[PDB]
Design a protein around this ligand. Sequence first.
Ligand code: HEM
Ligand code: HEM
Lengths: 164, 164
Amino acid sequence: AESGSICEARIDFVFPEVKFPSKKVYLAAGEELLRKLVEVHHENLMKSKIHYLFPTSHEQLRSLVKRSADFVVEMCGGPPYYTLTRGEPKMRARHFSVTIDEKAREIWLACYKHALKDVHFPLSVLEEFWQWIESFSIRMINRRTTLEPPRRVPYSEIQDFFVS
Amino acid sequence: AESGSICEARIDFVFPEVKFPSKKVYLAAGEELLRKLVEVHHENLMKSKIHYLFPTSHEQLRSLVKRSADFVVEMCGGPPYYTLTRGEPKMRARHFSVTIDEKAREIWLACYKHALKDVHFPLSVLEEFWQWIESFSIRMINRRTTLEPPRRVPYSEIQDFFVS
Ligand code: HEM
Ligand code: HEM
């Protein structure tokens, strides 16, 4: 960068392909486990270093957990609890009101990995679920703090955690 | 986006090409005027809706105005005041230290439009300078709050303003 120079157009980071879970996940896990999963993720979050991002206030966060759970149940192939009640996901946009940097996503993911184990999510559909949130979560990042692309964490990296 | 769906890869917004000013800018304006331009731009910034982002302490304020003026003088073709002191520009990275959303860039730009007129920046190189900051400023944005791309402000939209 100096006088006269030309900087070509460039992109910061690409939002990778997102594979939504097949209906096998809803069938293997069932609605009750899915809802419990989200509740435990939320509990993990409230104990995490990003607890401050989350409305504290029983009514506030009881409605939030319910919403997230409806979203997860529907997207894993259950009934349309979410779109019948909130409509179009438009998730990135819904997250604009909260500051989400790269570290925030990693902690959100780590809390989810722990919840997946804590609730004994069936191993057979675990990768389908993981690869969904691992990639989808990248699109919620709205505060950049590095030139590096957001970290990828493939199931292969964490699978040993679920058999130990 | 639903169970089984595959959202393909995508980018948020492109950093468009940036044309840095030719040395003609420094030749036409001179070091004094470029430093006054930066000084005035900062006076405007302190009176603007992003005033909170900038220092209140007089010593810190002087330091930053100096760095920006050194950068502008150098980048317009003057002596290398910035690289000799602060070193490599890496401007996007240096700006991670402050939260900059789309509106912040718009306000920073409108403050610059007024400064440029206020100090009677030479008409021969005004467009060259404007197109540099209008595009370069896009790469400073590190907080996204909309799905829309950052607003483009071509010189043609504002050219009448400079001439009355
Ligand atoms: C990337 C890290 C993420 C963080 C830190 C995060 C945090 C949050 C916070 C703080 C809210 C509440 C916003 C409010 O109170 O208005 C929220 C809303 C929500 N989040 Fe996330 N989130 C993340 C990613 C995701 C991902 C990947 C999904 C889905 C797979 C998701 C699903 C939801 C849903 C369904 C809601 C409620 C939306 C509604 O009200 O309709 N989030 N999130
Ligand atoms: C787009 C909206 C922008 C905003 C809101 C903004 C604001 C700021 C702030 C708050 C600082 C001090 C940061 C700190 O020390 O913590 C700073 C530093 C600086 N800004 Fe910007 N800026 C913007 C764009 C630009 C552009 C486009 C340029 C150059 C064309 C620029 C040139 C500089 C320079 C040279 C510094 C000093 C860097 C150093 O410490 O060496 N800024 N800016």
